[PDB]
Every structure is written in structure tokens, then in C-alpha cells.
């Protein structure tokens, strides 16, 4: 069991690095996703002006 | 009367058996655990590059 708990800690430290980086990357994806969705209105409203 | 004299050995060999079993299972768990470390660690380390 002593070796077991130590093994579980190293698995957790590996988990930690991964989930942390997922979050960092998801922020970037989420940010540019919103822009991609709403750009049609940013341009659409701007074009209604001339129309 | 007669069955008594040999119970000492039942008990002795039971130690020996119990100690062999436990030492062995101990090493098994030790190795399996150490095996689990690199296996799961390398999986996450590789999956990080897949995410990147």
C-alpha cells in the first residue's frame, strides 16, 4: 500500500499538468469561437446602415 | 492425544506458506504499481501533444 499511494500521487501530478493545459487551450478556442459566431451580426448590422 | 503432537507443524508450514504468499503478492503489487506509473504518465504526456 505504501508504494500504491506513491504511485497514485505521480498519476495525479500527471493528471494535473494535462487538465491545466486543456483549460488554457479551451479558453483560446472558446474566445475565437464566439467571434466566429457573432461576426455575421457585426458585419450585418454595419451593412444595414448603408441599406 | 495422538492428533495433537503434529499441530505444531501445521502451524509452522502455515507461517511459511503465508509469508511466501505475502512476500510474493507484495512484489507483484510493487511492480504492477511501478508499471502503472509510466504507462499512465506516458499516455497523458502524449495526449498533451495531441491537444497542442
Amino acid at each position: 500500500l505504501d508504494v500504491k499511494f506513491m504511485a497514485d500521487t505521480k498519476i495525479a501530478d500527471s493528471k494535473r499538468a494535462f487538465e491545466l493545459q486543456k483549460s488554457a487551450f479551451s479558453e483560446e478556442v472558446n474566445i475565437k469561437t464566439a467571434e466566429a459566431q457573432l461576426a455575421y451580426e457585426l458585419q450585418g448590422a454595419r451593412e444595414q446602415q448603408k441599406i | 492425544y495422538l492428533h495433537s503432537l503434529g499441530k505444531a507443524r501445521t502451524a509452522q508450514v502455515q507461517k511459511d506458506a503465508r509469508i511466501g504468499e505475502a512476500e510474493a503478492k507484495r512484489d507483484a503489487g510493487i511492480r504492477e504499481a511501478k508499471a502503472k506509473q509510466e504507462k499512465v504518465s506516458a499516455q497523458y504526456l502524449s495526449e498533451i501533444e495531441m491537444a497542442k
Side-chain angles (χ1 to χ4, degrees), chain A residues 6 10 14-15 18 21, chain B residues 37 41 44 47-48 52:
Chain A
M6 177 271 287
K10 294 176 68 182
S14 304
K15 182 65 165 175
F18 195 7
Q21 290 202 309
Chain B
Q37 294 181 27
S41 182
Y44 291 170
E47 290 159 6
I48 280 163
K52 286 166 178 171

Side-chain angles (χ1 to χ4, degrees), chain B residues 6-8 10-17 19-25 27:
Chain B
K7 294 175 185 179
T10 70
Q12 291 153 16
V13 304
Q14 281 272 9
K15 311 169 168 199
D16 307 333
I19 292 143
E21 286 190 44
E23 289 286 8
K25 291 163 191 180
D27 292 350

Side-chain angles (χ1 to χ4, degrees), chain A residues 1-14:
Chain A
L1 294 168
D2 185 4
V3 176
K4 269 301 338 301
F5 290 118
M6 177 271 287
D8 304 331
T9 64
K10 294 176 68 182
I11 287 167
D13 261 312
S14 304

Side-chain angles (χ1 to χ4, degrees), chain A residues 7-15 17-31 33-35:
Chain A
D8 304 331
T9 64
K10 294 176 68 182
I11 287 167
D13 261 312
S14 304
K15 182 65 165 175
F18 195 7
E19 308 309 326
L20 162 61
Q21 290 202 309
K22 291 179 194 172
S23 307
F25 310 157
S26 293
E27 284 175 43
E28 277 286 334
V29 175
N30 292 342
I31 283 163
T33 294
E35 296 169 331

